[PDB]
Write a protein that binds this ligand. Structure first.
Ligand SMILES: CCCOc1ccc(NC(=O)CN2CCN(C)CC2)cc1-c1nc(CC)c(CC)c(=O)[nH]1
Ligand SMILES: [Mg+2]
Ligand SMILES: [Zn+2]
Length: 290
């Protein structure tokens, strides 16, 4: 054991309301690394994952520290904080968005692990789905490392089922796969044909839900979104006048239809769509000022 694992395993885990991780407007700028690790423990706990799958506390703590360490801090956006924010949005969509009741325990377990792991070992956008296969491979290696096996409490049937959902969920964060598959998702939604009891449409929904959380910074309050866009711009160009229009085009081409479709599935996910619309106004106003 290191000093980090000792102090994290011995610390008090505040409640979900104290940590504000149920809010879609959650922000991590004021949190330390230890504090984000505590938020992650609370996410597993309040989703009943520690209870239903008999996770040892020090194993989960070791797993979280392994995932965090296998992100690169020198990468401006695709780092541990992006993975942590993606998982927080997944938690909020499950809790506040009331999506948790539409899914099974194994699907929730896999979505949370996938959200935290979907960009492992990312080197930056400057440095198919070749990358997402590497991300899942990093996730699988951590899940099998000694002392980090948070899935040990599962039977082989549950374990094999969970690994497949994790793999599909991480591969789904490839925007090319999202663009190829979202046409079917919007077809069913606009035809009042969408049904989650269908295994094919359920897996499609899990893919869209991964992308919605992956891009959720675009939905944040304007002071926060402006800060995240600064990180994205740093990674895109360094590792300004055209950024406002680029964001508007990104919101129109990618984000708006997704968060509108997600609101159709769950009305309580509307805060994501509403924050995305407000950010489009702010960016469009700046684009016209150039
Ligand atoms: C802030 C600096 C500029 O960021 C961007 C610039 C351009 C694009 N365009 C596209 O991705 C694809 N375009 C192709 C041309 N099409 C007409 C429209 C769609 C996206 C971003 C962007 N990507 C992410 C995710 C990493 C985030 C984080 C949520 C973000 O905030 N902005
Ligand atoms: Mg990625
Ligand atoms: Zn990502």
């Amino acid at each position: 054991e290191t000093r980090e694992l000792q102090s994290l395993a011995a610390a008090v885990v505040p409640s979900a309301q104290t940590l504000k991780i149920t809010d879609f407007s959650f922000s991590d700028f004021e949190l330390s690394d230890l504090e984000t690790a505590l938020c992650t423990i609370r996410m597993f706990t309040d989703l009943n994952l520690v209870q239903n799958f008999q996770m040892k506390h020090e194993v989960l703590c070791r797993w979280i520290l392994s995932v965090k360490k296998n992100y690169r801090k020198n990468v401006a956006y695709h780092n541990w904080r992006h993975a942590f924010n993606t998982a927080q949005c997944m938690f909020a969509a499950l809790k506040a968005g009331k999506i948790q009741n539409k899914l099974t325990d194994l699907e929730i377990l896999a979505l949370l692990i996938a959200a935290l792991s979907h960009d492992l070992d990312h080197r930056g956008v400057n440095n198919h789905s070749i990358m997402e296969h590497h991300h899942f491979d990093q996730c699988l290696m951590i899940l099998n490392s000694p002392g980090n096996q948070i899935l040990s409490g599962l039977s082989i049937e549950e374990y094999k089922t969970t690994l497949k959902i994790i793999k599909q969920a991480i591969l789904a964060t490839d925007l090319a796969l999202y663009i190829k598959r979202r046409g079917e998702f919007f077809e069913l939604i606009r035809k009042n044909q969408f049904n989650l009891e269908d295994p094919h449409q359920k897996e499609l929904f899990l893919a869209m839900l991964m992308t919605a959380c992956d891009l959720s910074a675009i939905t944040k309050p304007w002071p926060i979104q402006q800060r995240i866009a600064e990180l994205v711009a740093t990674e895109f160009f360094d590792q300004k006048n055209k950024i406002p229009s680029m964001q508007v085009g990104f919101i129109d081409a990618i984000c708006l239809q997704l968060y509108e479709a997600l609101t159709h599935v769950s009305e309580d996910c509307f805060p994501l769509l509403d924050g995305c619309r407000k950010n489009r106004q702010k960016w469009q106003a700046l684009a016209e000022q150039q």
